């Protein structure tokens, strides 16, 4: 997997 | 009050501290992922200088977490040098890092950071 | 690097923003009790202004408690004005304060606090 | 309770 998109 | 003295050179001991703790990795309490690179902050100080962190650490949920992994086009050198400007007021701004450090500010929501790359570039043109 | 440019007003920008979140009192980690009266706050923003708060929070041990006693003898408004200073560069020196103020910063180690309340104090004699 | 002293 996960990110700050 | 009304009736207040102030010390102008204050607010930049209290950073140039902060810098000191965070070199010294005292009280940091979150790893920022950038990549495979991975950089040791406090929450505040990047809440205080981002709008991107202001955002995720007012959030209930993702404040308790420890670890931010950041999106994959974000170059891990544009981030090291915003990260020293938050604790610093130096941005380290040079001909061959002005596009990643843009794209990392805009991502990172600084907007005096844009702002002064955006003249930067239009004054190479 | 030697080739960066500076925001003047960065350093009290941030200190504004840390003194927003300490009001409404976000990722505050500690309570520092002062006679019966409580006051939150940041470790970090602690450390970087006292010299007690920064041997405090050095020790491994004391830095894990989310609650901090001070001494009975320190009067909890002297306190809440140097708390004020800490976030905001300003402070609230009057003449029915200033006795209790100098005290509370000598106690704290505010070391510029200290210098400025006694030519305060020997100007009035 | 405890203060520092
Ligand atoms: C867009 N943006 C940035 O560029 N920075 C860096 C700001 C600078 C000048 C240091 O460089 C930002 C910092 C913050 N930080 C915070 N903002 C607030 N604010 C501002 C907003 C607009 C959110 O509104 C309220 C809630 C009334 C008060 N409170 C606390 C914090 Cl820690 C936010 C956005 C930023
Ligand atoms: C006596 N005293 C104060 O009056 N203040 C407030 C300082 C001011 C100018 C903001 O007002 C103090 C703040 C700190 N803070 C810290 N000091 C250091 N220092 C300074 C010392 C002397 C400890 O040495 C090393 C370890 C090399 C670096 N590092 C980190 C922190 Cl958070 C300390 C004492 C203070």
Redesign the pocket.
Known sequence: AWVIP | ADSCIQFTR?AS??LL??N??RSRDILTDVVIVVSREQFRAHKTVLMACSGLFYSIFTDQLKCNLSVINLDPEINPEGFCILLDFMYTSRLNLREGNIMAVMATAMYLQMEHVVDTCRKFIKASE
Chains 1, 4 share one sequence.
């Open positions: 204050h001991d209290v501290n902060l000191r703790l």
